[PDB]
From a paper:
Here, we show that a novel Mn-dependent peroxidase is an important factor in tardigrade anhydrobiosis. We crystallized the putative globular domain that lacked the N-terminus 62 amino acids of g12777 protein (g12777-Δ62) and solved the crystal structures as two forms containing Mn2+ or Zn2+ ions at 2.30 Å and 1.60 Å resolutions, respectively. The functional assays conducted here suggest that g12777 is a manganese-dependent peroxidase, independent of other components of the cell.
The Mn2+-bound g12777 crystals prepared by soaking method (50 mM Mn2+) using Zn2+-bound crystals indicated that the Zn2+ ion in the Zn-1 site was replaced with Mn2+. Additionally, an Mn2+ ion was found to be bound at a new binding site (Mn-2), whereas the Zn2+ in Zn-2–5 disappeared. A part of the β5–β6 loop (residues 163–168) around the Mn2+-binding site was disordered in the Mn2+-bound crystal, suggesting its flexible nature. In the Mn2+-binding site located at the negatively charged patch comprising β1–β2 and β3–β4 loops, the side-chain oxygen atoms of Asp92, Asp98, and Asp131 and the main-chain carbonyl atom of Ala96 and two water molecules coordinate with Mn2+ ion at distances of 2.2–2.9 Å. A considerable conformational difference was observed between Mn2+- and Zn2+-bound forms in terms of the metal-binding site, in which Asp92 and Asp98 were commonly involved in Mn2+ and Zn2+ binding. These aspartic acid residues were highly conserved within tardigrade orthologs, and the highly conserved CD-CD motif containing two Asp residues (D92 and D98) was used in the metal ion binding in both structures, suggesting the importance of these residues. The presence of a disulfide bond close to the Mn-1 binding site is suggestive of the utilization of the disulfide bond as an electron acceptor, which could categorize this protein as a new class of peroxidase. The recombinant β-sandwich domain of g12777 protein (g12777-Δ62) showed significant peroxidase activity when Mn2+ ions but not Zn2+ ions were present. The sample buffer used for this assay contains 0.1% BSA, and the manufacturer warrants the lack of non-specific protein catalysis by BSA up to 1 mg/ml with this kit. This reaction (H2O2 + CH3OH → HCHO + 2H2O) was carried out without the presence of hemes, thus suggesting that this protein is distinguished from most Mn peroxidases. Furthermore, we speculate that this affinity is related to the localization of this protein mainly in the Golgi apparatus since it has a strictly controlled high manganese concentration, suggesting the antioxidative stress functionality in the Golgi apparatus seems to be crucial for anhydrobiotic survival.
Numbering used by the authors: 66 to 162, 169 to 226
């Protein structure tokens, strides 16, 4: 499988205390205003956060006002073209619209994981991402799928 697509879904953020990574409240009369930026790290997945590419260069995928624990439902897509990758890491930053949490959902990419095609690429299990701070207090969940694509479709 020398040409394949990785899609990772940031499923949901849970912040019952409505706090920041520094542990104070996002909003003292309201809830967090979470802004989600993310990036699927193929080149330095086993390195410390942020990995290969700096957070400030990531695309904004989800936004919300006064929802500590929003459902997200949004994908980050990456393609491995012309060779093999053994894992990938969905690096996520969450800010209060100010750091809520830096997360890392590392994902194996063994042969098991990359389906022969898109229709046969079932989502894998929901996985909790690793946070820099507030482990278990501010949680982020995400799942992966991967499937072979034709080379002319690989970005
Ligand atoms: Mn797709
Ligand atoms: Mn707010």
């Amino acid at each position: 499988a020398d040409f394949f697509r990785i899609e990772t879904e940031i499923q949901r953020l849970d912040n019952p205390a409505g706090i920041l990574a520094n542990g104070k409240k996002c909003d003292f009369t309201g809830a967090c205003d979470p802004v989600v930026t993310a990036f699927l790290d193929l080149e330095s997945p086993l390195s410390p956060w942020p990995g290969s590419v700096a957070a400030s260069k990531w695309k904004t995928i989800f936004e919300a006002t006064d929802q500590n624990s929003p459902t997200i439902g949004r994908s980050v897509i990456r393609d491995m073209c012309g060779g093999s990758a053994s894992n990938v890491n969905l690096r996520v930053l969450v800010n209060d619209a100010d750091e809520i949490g830096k997360f890392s959902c590392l994902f194996q990419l063994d042969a098991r994981d990359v389906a022969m095609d898109s229709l046969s690429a079932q989502w894998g299990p929901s996985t909790e991402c690793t946070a820099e701070a507030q482990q278990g207090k501010i949680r982020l969940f995400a799942r992966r799928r991967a499937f072979e694509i034709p080379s002319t479709s690989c970005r």
